[PDB]
Symmetry: D2
Subunit: 267 residues, 4 copies
Amino acid sequence: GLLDGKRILVSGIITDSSIAFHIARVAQEQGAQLVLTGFDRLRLIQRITDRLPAKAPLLELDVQNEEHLASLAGRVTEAIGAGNKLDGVVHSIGFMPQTGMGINPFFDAPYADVSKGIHISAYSYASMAKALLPIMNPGGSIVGMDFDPSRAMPAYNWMTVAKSALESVNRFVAREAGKYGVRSNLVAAGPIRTLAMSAIVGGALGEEAGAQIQLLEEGWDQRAPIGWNMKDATPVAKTVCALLSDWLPATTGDIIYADGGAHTQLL
Amino acid sequence: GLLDGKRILVSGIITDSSIAFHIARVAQEQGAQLVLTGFDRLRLIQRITDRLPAKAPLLELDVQNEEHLASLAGRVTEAIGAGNKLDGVVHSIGFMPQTGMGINPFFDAPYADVSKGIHISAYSYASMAKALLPIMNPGGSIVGMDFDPSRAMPAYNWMTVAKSALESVNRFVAREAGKYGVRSNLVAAGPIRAQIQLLEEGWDQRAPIGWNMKDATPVAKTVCALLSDWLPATTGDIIYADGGAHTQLL
Amino acid sequence: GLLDGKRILVSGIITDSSIAFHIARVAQEQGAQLVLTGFDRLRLIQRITDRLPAKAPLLELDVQNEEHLASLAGRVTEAIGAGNKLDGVVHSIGFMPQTGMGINPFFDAPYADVSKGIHISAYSYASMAKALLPIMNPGGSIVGMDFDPSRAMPAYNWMTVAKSALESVNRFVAREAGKYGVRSNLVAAGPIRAQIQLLEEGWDQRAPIGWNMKDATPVAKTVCALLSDWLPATTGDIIYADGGAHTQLL
Amino acid sequence: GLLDGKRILVSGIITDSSIAFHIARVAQEQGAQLVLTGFDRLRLIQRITDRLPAKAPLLELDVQNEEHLASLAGRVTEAIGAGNKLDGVVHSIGFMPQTGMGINPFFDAPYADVSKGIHISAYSYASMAKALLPIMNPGGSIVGMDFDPSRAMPAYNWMTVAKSALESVNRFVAREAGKYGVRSNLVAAGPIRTLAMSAIVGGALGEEAGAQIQLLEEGWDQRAPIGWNMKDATPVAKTVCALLSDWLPATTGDIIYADGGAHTQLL
Ligand SMILES: NC(=O)c1ccc[n+]([C@@H]2O[C@H](COP(=O)([O-])OP(=O)(O)OC[C@H]3O[C@@H](n4cnc5c(N)ncnc54)[C@H](O)[C@@H]3O)[C@@H](O)[C@H]2O)c1
Ligand SMILES: NC(=O)c1ccc[n+]([C@@H]2O[C@H](COP(=O)([O-])OP(=O)(O)OC[C@H]3O[C@@H](n4cnc5c(N)ncnc54)[C@H](O)[C@@H]3O)[C@@H](O)[C@H]2O)c1
Ligand SMILES: NC(=O)c1ccc[n+]([C@@H]2O[C@H](COP(=O)([O-])OP(=O)(O)OC[C@H]3O[C@@H](n4cnc5c(N)ncnc54)[C@H](O)[C@@H]3O)[C@@H](O)[C@H]2O)c1
Ligand SMILES: NC(=O)c1ccc[n+]([C@@H]2O[C@H](COP(=O)([O-])OP(=O)(O)OC[C@H]3O[C@@H](n4cnc5c(N)ncnc54)[C@H](O)[C@@H]3O)[C@@H](O)[C@H]2O)c1
Ligand SMILES: Cc1cc(N)n(Cc2ccccc2)n1
Ligand SMILES: Cc1cc(N)n(Cc2ccccc2)n1
Ligand SMILES: Cc1cc(N)n(Cc2ccccc2)n1
Ligand SMILES: Cc1cc(N)n(Cc2ccccc2)n1
């Protein structure tokens, strides 16, 4: 398998539609031994991770919690065993309150909400790198999840702002990670219709919000020379696994686009 | 004059070395009538702005203060007279605590420091556009100050992260500004006054026409070019006033 | 005037709809004294340029003709008078045979067609800079015309490829221009007049301040802004005069 | 192996220092069945390809020759056998006469030399795609070799111009390739000291040219958070193999940087 013998920490599983759920699934299919981290609802997360091909210890991690971060390395060390290290780290954590993305006007998002969004979505990529680099093997790899923020797009609002910050954090994390022989990269994925986005499409935020996501999806599939299936996270999961492998050994501080080539085309 | 009869708001003057002092000075030289804003040290700022070629009312604005933002348009309206609107807005506001910018390791900047820095340097660009667009004329222009964050670099650290967020906020501000027939753009300047020195000195070497980090005038003139009617099809964009250093690898 | 007393060379006029005709017109309105260049149909071009606000000598220049290039500086020198130099040069020259641009499949453009297109649209930018830099004043400015080629699109095909090569040539021209204290920049314009129509109409929708493909004036004004002294720290760069369409995804 | 059962055409082998030689070597190590193409000196090329882990049919291909292009698909079909198709295409062909890159001033390169350089380096990426797409399987992959031309750099001159054109050609090739379910991408590599560059370092083009390449190499290794070894093409070869695999299935019309992360850093 592509990741045979590799010890990989994977964060961000909340539902079986989570991009992380599919990263974990494909990583296990490729012979990786995983350590999973979950936020808040750990009983629910355990029930979700029970749906994976194989068993994996599950650790609690709230990236806004300093105690969880200060203890993370020792907790990982305990789960994988003394004398062992992590070969890979997957950051698949993203959040922005409704006030910062959706139908709320861009100017009406309060800074508390935007700052919480940027803490979890951008700053936490450096926090996790800081906590895990000392327990990472040389040749190691850290992958974060990006959504192309190069051009402004309706609805995404402050989440697009958080992704621009994340892109910058990634290049600085690469400088630190390099000292440990570790690579740091982001995967910029096309839109994925998780349980949450399926509710917006249905109308949880009103008919205007639904139509906004319906138009994005259509446009993305049209633009992509190989097409784009919003319901399938496998292509994105495989790209993350490719960055976790030894098959992109000279790529760091960079962004790999798993978007069907949509960002390279105007129409 | 290039900005003849234009009413322009200029924020960010702290010393006569501030880029905003040079923007203010060049704008006044080009016939603009100014409204200035100052943070925290308003008596100190008034003595600095006395050194400007012409008189300009000075208003207080702490970008982290919601009361200052809610009252900003009304206060500028009093200062420029009822039935008068702004043609230009200059955002020359930036800050990052020392833990997130300089010799401090990147990983050791607490989030409260990074957030305060992002609030002032990036969020406030949208805050000032929200407050002032309702008192802006069509053909109007909003200009922000940027330091190229496309590549990582020593020392600038979390300020580079805030500039990446600012470039994103600018694209969204342009979307809102458009409805008012107003442009929103950033000026990416070269640095203005061992790892830091080599990083800084690399700008002159790299720049095909050179770079003088002691001369803020080329950057001030670029801001005024965006504030004029001479770039009317440019919005949500970045204009590099860096000697062309960003276009050369060596 | 913005270009008061400046001596500027303007190439690329063919009809009164040519972007170069509008650059010429705006430059003359801003006090510039022009020298024009024309290709192949010099009698036709003279009648078009009579419609300009002021008189300007017209010279022949086939960018594919080495003799025209070798004699260009000497001929401009006669036209502007001995001991006088150019302050500005406008390259508004482009061409791609129909096999490489439009309805023809991308793969069916023979290399001779693509090469002729690249020679005229990209190589000639370096050719004109080589010929004219020796007769340019410091503080001088060279401006080229670009159509954003960062993303592929229907129809433009091999012209998009030539624009990608032009953006690269511009960065190298800036390196040489620098020695003469001269700037080199491109203006990336939005399109000026079923797959093509949707591609074109998408500019207005995308542009936060809008886009009028019938009005070449915003692009002409942007060229003049680069030709002025108001963007003196910008070189080897691209200025987008496209309504800000390139900064918006939808 | 990563490319087990895959039929891949690899062009651009001239010496055992060629980036293509190492692409081929790593591809064979990963279970790929290769078809090689070579320009002009085919006896010499056969002697070089004899140094590879396994045997591979060798076809003649001069990308400036229309007859070689019109016959390429049928010649490949003959070598791999009736009923079989190509899964991958590697374009590793680049040329620019000395007048267009090195010590010659940028303005002194004649258009004939620049046009020849752009024909072989940029146009030929579309010519090969046009000739090989009809004999390519769905899920197929075409990879070309790029050298980051985003910023002007001394010495590279018109070769940097040719690479900017190639980057644009790649996005248009992706539009065509997509119709056949095929991906098209470029690998932007850091500098590799092939036999030719080793001669420039030694002084074949004068002392000024050598110092120019000596400064580039040093700067690239310093800038890269994981470092850069100009004498090693393996990291670049592995990245090309990663694009030839099914592990980057949603990436097309794009550029993957195998440069040690140098382009993401200023100093
Ligand atoms: N869904 C898309 O269309 C899309 C597209 C591109 C990128 N992404 C990115 O992919 C990543 C995964 O998101 P997803 O789309 O799978 O949605 P998701 O809701 O399934 O996953 C995001 C995760 O963030 C976690 N999280 C939130 N706050 C946290 C905290 N304080 N501490 C720790 N974890 C916390 C949640 O528990 C959840 O597991 C995110 O970075 C997201 O921004 C999503
Ligand atoms: N000097 C450089 O090297 C350089 C280069 C590129 C961009 N810039 C940018 O130019 C702008 C001005 O920088 P400068 O070099 O003139 O420095 P400066 O110190 O003169 O200006 C920064 C200004 O921000 C103001 N400010 C801080 N906190 C504030 C708050 N809460 N509310 C309102 N105003 C607040 C300060 O009072 C000060 O006037 C900033 O956006 C900066 O990031 C500077
Ligand atoms: N119109 C648009 O949609 C648009 C958009 C962006 C950029 N541009 C660019 O603007 C420039 C002018 O385009 P335009 O729209 O005004 O079209 P145009 O037809 O008016 O101008 C092109 C000019 O190139 C000249 N030319 C052709 N071959 C030549 C040669 N061998 N030697 C010298 N001159 C030669 C022609 O005589 C003509 O005047 C070109 O570089 C074009 O690519 C056009
Ligand atoms: N060497 C570097 O530092 C470096 C860096 C980045 C990218 N590249 C690119 O990698 C690719 C391979 O180059 P390399 O560095 O291995 O050098 P190389 O000399 O070993 O390979 C280039 C190949 O181009 C072939 N070629 C030239 N003209 C041809 C024609 N008419 N028809 C067919 N083939 C022709 C040559 O025969 C040779 O095999 C090129 O695209 C090059 O531009 C090289
Ligand atoms: C870019 C993007 C799209 C989606 N769904 N996410 C994750 C997320 C989770 C919670 C709130 C907001 C966003 N990120
Ligand atoms: C990019 C840049 C350079 C400088 N001096 N600034 C402003 C600033 C003000 C206070 C603290 C930190 C930074 N921004
Ligand atoms: C980008 C663009 C659009 C137009 N009209 N041009 C000039 C041109 C002239 C002749 C043939 C083809 C193109 N360039
Ligand atoms: C970018 C780059 C570096 C090297 N050596 N090449 C290949 C090449 C082959 C012949 C002549 C010129 C260049 N491409």
